[PDB]
Amino acid sequence: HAFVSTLTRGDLSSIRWVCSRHAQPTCPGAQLCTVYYASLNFRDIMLATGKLSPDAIPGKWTSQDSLLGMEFSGRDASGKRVMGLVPAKGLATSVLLSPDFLWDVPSNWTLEEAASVPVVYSTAYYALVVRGRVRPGETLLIHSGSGGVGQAAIAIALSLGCRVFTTVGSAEKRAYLQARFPQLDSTSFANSRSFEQHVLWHTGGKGVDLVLNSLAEEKLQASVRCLATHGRFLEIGKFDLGMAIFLKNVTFHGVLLDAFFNESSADWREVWALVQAGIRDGVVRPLKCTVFHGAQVEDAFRYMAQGKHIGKVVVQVLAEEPE
Amino acid sequence: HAFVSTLTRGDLSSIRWVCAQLCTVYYASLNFRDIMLATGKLSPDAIPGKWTSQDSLLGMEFSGRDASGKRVMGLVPAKGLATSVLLSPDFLWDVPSNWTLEEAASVPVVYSTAYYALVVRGRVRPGETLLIHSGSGGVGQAAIAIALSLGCRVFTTVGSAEKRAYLQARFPQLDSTSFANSSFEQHVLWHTGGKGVDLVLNSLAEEKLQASVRCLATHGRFLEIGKFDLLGMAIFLKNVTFHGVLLDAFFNESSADWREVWALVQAGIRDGVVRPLKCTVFHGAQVEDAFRYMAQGKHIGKVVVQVLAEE
Ligand SMILES: Oc1cc(Cl)ccc1Oc1ccc(Cl)cc1Cl
Ligand SMILES: [Cl-]
Ligand SMILES: [Cl-]
Ligand SMILES: [Cl-]
Ligand SMILES: [Cl-]
Ligand code: NA
Numbered sequence: 001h002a003f004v005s006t007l008t009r010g011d012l013s014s015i016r017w018v019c020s021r022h023a024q025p026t027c028p029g030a031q032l033c034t035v036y037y038a039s040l041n042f043r044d045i046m047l048a049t050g051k052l053s054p055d056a057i058p059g060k061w062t063s064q065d066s067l068l069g070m071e072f073s074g075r076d077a078s079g080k081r082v083m084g085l086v087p088a089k090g091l092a093t094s095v096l097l098s099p100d101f102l103w104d105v106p107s108n109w110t111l112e113e114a115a116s117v118p119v120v121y122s123t124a125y126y127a128l129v130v131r132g133r134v135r136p137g138e139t140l141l142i143h144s145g146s147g148g149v150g151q152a153a154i155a156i157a158l159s160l161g162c163r164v165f166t167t168v169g170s171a172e173k174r175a176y177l178q179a180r181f182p183q184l185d186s187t188s189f190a191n192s193r194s195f196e197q198h199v200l201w202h203t204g205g206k207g208v209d210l211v212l213n214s215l216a217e218e219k220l221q222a223s224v225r226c227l228a229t230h231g232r233f234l235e236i237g238k239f240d241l242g243m244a245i246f247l248k249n250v251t252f253h254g255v256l257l258d259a260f261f262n263e264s265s266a267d268w269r270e271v272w273a274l275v276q277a278g279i280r281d282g283v284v285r286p287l288k289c290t291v292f293h294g295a296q297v298e299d300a301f302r303y304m305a306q307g308k309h310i311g312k313v314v315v316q317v318l319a320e321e322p323e
Numbered sequence: 324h325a326f327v328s329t330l331t332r333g334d335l336s337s338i339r340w341v342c343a344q345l346c347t348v349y350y351a352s353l354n355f356r357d358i359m360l361a362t363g364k365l366s367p368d369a370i371p372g373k374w375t376s377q378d379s380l381l382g383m384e385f386s387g388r389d390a391s392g393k394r395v396m397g398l399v400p401a402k403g404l405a406t407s408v409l410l411s412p413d414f415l416w417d418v419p420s421n422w423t424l425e426e427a428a429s430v431p432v433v434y435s436t437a438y439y440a441l442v443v444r445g446r447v448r449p450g451e452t453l454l455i456h457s458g459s460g461g462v463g464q465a466a467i468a469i470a471l472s473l474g475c476r477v478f479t480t481v482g483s484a485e486k487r488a489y490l491q492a493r494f495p496q497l498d499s500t501s502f503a504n505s506s507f508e509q510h511v512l513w514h515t516g517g518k519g520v521d522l523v524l525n526s527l528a529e530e531k532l533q534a535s536v537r538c539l540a541t542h543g544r545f546l547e548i549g550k551f552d553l554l555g556m557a558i559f560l561k562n563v564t565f566h567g568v569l570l571d572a573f574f575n576e577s578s579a580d581w582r583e584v585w586a587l588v589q590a591g592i593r594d595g596v597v598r599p600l601k602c603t604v605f606h607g608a609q610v611e612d613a614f615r616y617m618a619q620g621k622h623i624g625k626v627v628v629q630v631l632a633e634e
Pocket of ligand 4: 367378380381
């Protein structure tokens with residue numbers, strides 16, 4: 001067994017593979033999977049650079065545990081291709097996890113790209129459907145549309161018949177989204193020319209019903225101004241109060257999946273089912289992947305941290321075998 | 324027709340009387356917003372709706388009689404502190420026989436607010452637990468009444484022993500464990516088995532947000548009533564939902580949504596859940612005294628201005 005860990009806490013240059021046989025659990029509640037690809041998420045960057053303490057992550061961890069890695073694709077003990085969510089420790093040669101957090105990988109998918117799906121789509125479905133309760137014909141404002149969760153949210157929003165507005169960091173990102181999502185038109189892109197004025201003008205002065213991730217971009221105040229009454233804010237936890245909030249009867253939803261691995265495990269399969277149905281119906285599409293050899297894991301992190309990429313940064317722990 | 328107005332904006336000493344369904348106002352209650360307006364801490368431009376510079380917005384609720392003489396109580400978007408109000412019948416309730424008009428004037432705002440916050444927004448369920456800050460406050464008392472009627476366990480913080488004593492006497496269903504600050508987070512955590520509470524009401528007003536999060540259950544909800552005189556990772560890890568609440572929208576763009584709240588209040592009256600607050604009454608001529616006393620915030624229940632004595 002081997003996992004990725006920073007030698008000295010907070011130093012990304014000290015990152016390396018620590019090597020060392022984990023037993024197969026008999027009980028149906030736990031399962032040992034072989035990791036082929038492990039995706040990087042922003043939290044992994046926060047942990048490795050020391051901006052985030054592992055003591056902050058919920059669960060039962062020891063002082064020697066490395067929590068790097070939140071999602072993977074690979075094979076179960078029987079050799080079936082799977083992808084899954086893990087509370088931590090995804091960046092390893094094998095993962096021990098509950099089968100409740102596994103999905104089968106569609107035959108037309110590569111293992112490589114399947115690794116990009118679990119976190120962003122589980123997060124987007126939980127936020128929009130379970131928490132946001134999106135309804136057809138409602139309007140959404142998705143900040144950072146080309147970002148991982150943004151892309152998932154756009155795909156889900158459009159599938160449920162919702163009208164989508166988004167903000168993006170660049171023309172390239174705008175161009176990418178327009179091509180990936182032909183249902184979008186030029187009016188969908190709110191920050192190409194302020195975004196709140198744009199939204200108001202294309203919502204009959206009424207504003208949008210839901211806003212996703214305004215805090216990450218520091219666009220909350222502006223977002224309230226183009227929010228409809230009884231609007232809902234959806235904000236995914238990132239480890240880094242005007243009167244309008246009350247007059248408009250605004251609701252704020254703080255969102256993270258960590259609880260589903262713990263005290264909220266009884267409510268997880270609702271989210272699991274949403275992802276599964278989305279896969280079946282073609283809504284859930286793998287993101288674009290930039291792949292690094294596991295031996296270049298440090299390079300993957302530094303590349304990820306720059307945040308200039310589109311899609312997912314994936315680490316190849318074990319190359320998928322030829323068919 | 325006459326209404327209360329500050330002749331000079333922001334000078335409470337200059338306050339005086341100035342000489343859909345039309346109702347005669349017998350009693351007009353004061354709310355903190357009225358104080359904010361009268362003392363100039365709040366601009367009338369901040370209050371939604373179509374008002375003119377000549378309007379006085381003082382007064383949010385009343386009791387009296389409609390045109391046909393039937394005793395009523397109601398919510399108004401503004402202009403409640405007057406000899407008459409013009410309003411949609413959607414914002415009127417019949418006054419029960421056992422109530423005086425005096426005390427009926429204490430009901431509309433706090434119970435409409437409490438029902439909308441706890442039931443419509445909070446979606447409180449039987450067997451869930453609530454932390455109600457400032458339990459002796461108007462909305463707090465309404466919230467406690469509603470929570471107990473729905474089979475919820477109530478925790479509350481109070482400013483003094485008198486307030487506890489009043490609440491304990493007003494609500495015999497409460498016990499010693501209901502009063503969390505006789506630290507509340509430690510008290511709450513111990514009496515919820517470390518699970519925390521499902522709902523918290525008005526932590527911001529009391530400056531108890533951080534501590535309230537610490538004794539909040541996963542998927543817990545914060546309910547916060549707007550006040551014009553106003554983020555750890557736990558917020559996200561616990562999947563917290565925050566509800567900002569005010570009734571103003573119901574008079575305007577959310578009029579279609581109002582009936583649910585109206586019916587909740589009416590039903591609460593029917594089931595005897597809705598009980599009038601204690602009232603401290605001032606004659607209309609001492610309207611200034613009423614404002615200054617209200618501003619002291621030492622009272623328990625409602626401050627009410629008698630515009631016209633009940634026959
Ligand atoms: O004070 C808060 C308390 C909680 Cl539990 C959650 C969010 C809070 O602050 C907010 C409330 C509403 C909106 Cl739309 C945005 C923000 Cl940042
Ligand atoms: Cl993070
Ligand atoms: Cl599309
Ligand atoms: Cl005014
Ligand atoms: Cl009682
Ligand atoms: Na106020």
